Amino acid sequence: NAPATVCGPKQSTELIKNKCVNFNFNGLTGTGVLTDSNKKFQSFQQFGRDVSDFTDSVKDPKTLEVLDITPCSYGGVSVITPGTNASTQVAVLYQDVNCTDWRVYSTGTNMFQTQAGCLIGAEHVNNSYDCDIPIGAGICATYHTNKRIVAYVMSLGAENSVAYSNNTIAI
């Protein structure tokens, strides 16, 4: 909870920044990414707190500069699949990845941004069918013909037009 001058004998490694590491600052262990911070600790403070009680910053005991601590796990992931006993291939939607050119499991071969996240494993088609598997933000997916997962913009309905006239009626 405070700066300390009595410690057990463990080790003193170098600082690893911009990388998810297992840290140990004055006995406080945890995992996260250490980055340089624009925070000024008041010399009686060793750790910082967020709106929760999570330790989001720390004062390095050797070089007295504040380091931010952020979790290295982040970003929503969704799986797009047809049925089991229909196919085994899947498409993965990474909601918080901008792959328009990563934090993805596999780079695949099909990549395009959908405004609901990065879609990997489904090829874009210019056709507009009805929705089969809803992806989000106007994008749907289906298992369509050799069979593959395709992603498309959903169609709102049949295109129509009414021949409006000021002297014609339809009975």
Partner: protein, 241 residues
Amino acid sequence: EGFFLPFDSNVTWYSFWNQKYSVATSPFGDGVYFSTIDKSNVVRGWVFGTTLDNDTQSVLLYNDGTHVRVEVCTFHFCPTPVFSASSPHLYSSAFNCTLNYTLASVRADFTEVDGSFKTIREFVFKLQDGSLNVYYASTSYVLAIGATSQLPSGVTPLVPLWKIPIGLNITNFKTLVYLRSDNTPLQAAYVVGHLKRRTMMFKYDENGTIVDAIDCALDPLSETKCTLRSFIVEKGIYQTS
């Protein structure tokens, strides 16, 4: 929530000019608030204890001119212990003394400074598990030598300075000043408050400093600010405790 000085509380102001001198032993109940308004280095330190005689031991925390010393000794204190300029006229004898070390190297001269009051030095002394915790803040505060004897507006957060393991019972405390050349001391003032167990809400700015605290359970508006976790209250009806 902890031990805090309540807002707009009854606090006692003690004045010093060339005709009067007031160092009366204030009680130490659940911690005290101390604040000296001073143009020079008059209020040297404090004496903490129960009877302040030689039957029990006492804490002698003071500035000798160049260091801040704390002595937990059993003193035969002189009546009205003072400093005759830089010479400590504090005690006649000191024995059986369990703590004697310096806390900080602070150069504070005993020279008289003419003019008006310049700074306010605010202290919070509280006892936690046998240790005397000291909280300190210094703010520039220009006060004249008449027509007003009030405390400054706004807040100033006191930073935790020391944890002194005095390890003894404290019920009373006494302030000590310097007497110049054994006359009535110069222009100085000190305020003594008493902490109470209260909840309070603190607002931290973007730089991490406390600004604009509020006293929870002072009035129902402050309790509403407490419940809302905010310092802005919109117009409407609010249930309180």
